[PDB]
Design a binder for this molecule. Structure first.
Ligand SMILES: OC[C@H]1O[C@H](O)[C@@H](O)[C@@H](O)[C@@H]1O
Ligand SMILES: OC[C@H]1O[C@H](O)[C@@H](O)[C@@H](O)[C@@H]1O
Lengths: 297, 297
C-alpha cells in the first residue's frame, strides 16, 4: 500500500553555521500550505541535539517556498527560549489553521527535573508573530496537535502519554476531558518501542489520515499510517502493517541521531500531501503522497 | 509644518556581506503594513549603485517586522534579473494593495541603449511569488506607482517624465490616457533640479497625502510633501515649501551616493505613517508622521 515518495535525494533545508541558533541542526518542522506558499516552522539547535554534545537549545525558524522544495529562510527565529518551561527551548511544532488562526503545539523543554517537558500552545495570524498561551496538559507529554477542525463542537487533540498515542477533547482549550489511548506499539515489529503522531491529521472522504512515527528496539525511527473515523477519531478504521518511510538516504541514516525519519508537518496542495521530515535530527527532507493513493489493505 | 521623526539613529536594514546579491547596498524599499506586520520589498545591489563602482545589478529582497524597526530578512531575493528589460536588475519598487492583490511598480534597468529604463508591473497575493505583467509605459520613465484605490472607476498612476511628476489613468492597466504633469521643480530652492514621487499616496480626509523627493543643484536629495484633491488628483491642494526630511545622520550623508534620503515606501499602522527611506543609496532608515500632524500652511 502506502509509500511516501521523496521529491529529492537532497535535503530541502540544512543548518546554517553562521547563525548560532540554527548552526548545528534543522529538523522536525511544522508545515502548512497557505496563500499559494509552503511555510515551515522548523526546529533548530545551536549544537548537536543530544545530551552528549551539551545543553542544546531549540528555537523555531521560518522558511517559505513556492514549489515545496526550494526554500527561502528568515535570518532570525520566530520563537526563541523565553520562559522557564522553555529553558532548553521549543521543539517539534505541529500547526493547524482554524478560522483564520494558526494553533501551534510545541514541546517546552525545561530540564529542571525529571520529565520536565510539556505541550505548550502558541497562536498567530501570520506565522511570524506568535502569542504564547501556556502549557496545555500539565504532565510529561509531547507529540501533540489539534485536529484541523472542531468535531461536534469540540476541539480535539492528539498527545502521547508514553508510549502510546492518546486523544482528548476540550470546549475551550483550557481544560481537557475524555482522554483515551488510540494507538499502541506492537511487539516484535518496527513499531515495538513507542509511537507518536507525525504531523496533524488530514481530513479525507474515508476518515482522518494520520501519519505516525515509531521506534524499534534499536531506536530506529520510521513513519507509518493510520485512518481514524471522521466523527469519532478514537476509532481506528485501519492501520498499515508496514512503514510508509524509513531511513534510506545517507542524511537520513547518518547525523547527530542515526537512523531517524521524523515528521511534524504535512502540507496539502491540490490533493498532494507534502510530508516534511527531519533526517537524523540534523536536516529536513520532503516526500509526497497523492490523496488518491491513500489505500489500506 | 510637517517634519518626519526618525525612530532610530541607526538604519533598520543594512547590506549583508554573506549574500552577494545584497552585499553592497540595501535601499529604496517598498513598504506595506498587512496582517499585523510591516513588510519591506527592498532594492539590493552586489556592487555600489553607480557606474564608478562597477556593473551593479539590483534585485528585490523581502524583510518583515512586528514593530517597524527590527526586521527579519529572507536569504534570497523574491525577484531577480530575468528579462532583457532587467539586464541590470529591478529598482525602486512601489507597492499598493487593491482587492487582495499587491501591485508593484518597479524600474527595469536594461542599459542596452540611451535611457533604457522602464516602469514595469508585477503582481502578487503574498509578496513572495511575483508575476511579471510587463512594461507599463514604453518610454524613459521611473518613480511610478498606482494609487491604492480606483478613482471614479479608473486606475490612476503617478510617473516621472523628466523632470516632473505626471499622472495618468487607465481602465485596465494596459493602455493609459489623460497624461498630465502635476508637480514641477522650483528654481533656486532645494527642489530645483528634479522631482519624483516617494512612496504611493495615502488617502486622507483632506486629500491624497503624497511624499515626493527632489534634488537640488548639488544633487542633494530630500523629501517634501504635497496634498492632492481626492476626486481629481491632478489638482494640487497644497505643497509645503520646506522639506520634511533631509540628510542629517552620517549614514544619510555618507555612502555610495552622498547626501541622499529617498523613499519608495510608506506603511500605515493605526494612523501613523512609517516612511522607509534609503540613506546614501546604501542602507534603509525609518521615520514617522502621525496623520493628525498632516497640516499645510
Ligand atoms: O523533549 C526533550 C527531549 O526529548 C528527547 O530526548 C528528544 O526528542 C530531544 O530532541 C528533546 O530535546
Ligand atoms: O534607473 C537607472 C539608474 O538611474 C539612476 O542612475 C539611479 O537611480 C540608479 O540607481 C539607476 O540604476
Amino acid at each position: 500500500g502506502i509509500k511516501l515518495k521523496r521529491l529529492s535525494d537532497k535535503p530541502v533545508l540544512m543548518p546554517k553555521a553562521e547563525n548560532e541558533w540554527e548552526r548545528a541542526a534543522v529538523f522536525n518542522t511544522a508545515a502548512i500550505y497557505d496563500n499559494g506558499l509552503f511555510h515551515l516552522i522548523y526546529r533548530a539547535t545551536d549544537i548537536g541535539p543530544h545530551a552528549k554534545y551539551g545543553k542544546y537549545i531549540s528555537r523555531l525558524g521560518y522558511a517559505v517556498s513556492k514549489d515545496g522544495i526550494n526554500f527561502m529562510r528568515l535570518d532570525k527565529p520566530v520563537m526563541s527560549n523565553e520562559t522557564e518551561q522553555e529553558l532548553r527551548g521549543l521543539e517539534d511544532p505541529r500547526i493547524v489553521k482554524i478560522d483564520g488562526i494558526y494553533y501551534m503545539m510545541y514541546t517546552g523543554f525545561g530540564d529542571r527535573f525529571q520529565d520536565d517537558y510539556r505541550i505548550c500552545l502558541a497562536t498567530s495570524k501570520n506565522l511570524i508573530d506568535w502569542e504564547r498561551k501556556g502549557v496545555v496538559l500539565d504532565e510529561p507529554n509531547k507529540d501533540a496537535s489539534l485536529f484541523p477542525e472542531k468535531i461536534n463542537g469540540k476541539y480535539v487533540m492528539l498527545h502521547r502519554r508514553y508510549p502510546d498515542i492518546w486523544i482528548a477533547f476540550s470546549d475551550d482549550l483550557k481544560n481537557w476531558y475524555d482522554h483515551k489511548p488510540i494507538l499502541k506499539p506492537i511487539p516484535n515489529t518496527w513499531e515495538s518501542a513507542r509511537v507518536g503522531i507525525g504531523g496533524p491529521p488530514i481530513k479525507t472522504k474515508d476518515g482522518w489520515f494520520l501519519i505516525y512515527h515509531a521506534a524499534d528496539d534499536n531506536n530506529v525511527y520510521r513513519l507509518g499510517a493510520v485512518l481514524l473515523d471522521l466523527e469519532d477519531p478514537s476509532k481506528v478504521i485501519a492501520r498499515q502493517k508496514e512503514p510508509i518511510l524509513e531511513p534510506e538516504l545517507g542524511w537520513e541514516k547518518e547525523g547527530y541521531i542515526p537512523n531517524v525519519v521524523f515528521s511534524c508537518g504535512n502540507a496539502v496542495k491540490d490533493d498532494t500531501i507534502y510530508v516534511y521530515y527531519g533526517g537524523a535530527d540534523t536536516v529536513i527532507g520532503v516526500a509526497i503522497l497523492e490523496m488518491k493513493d491513500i489505500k489500506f489493505h
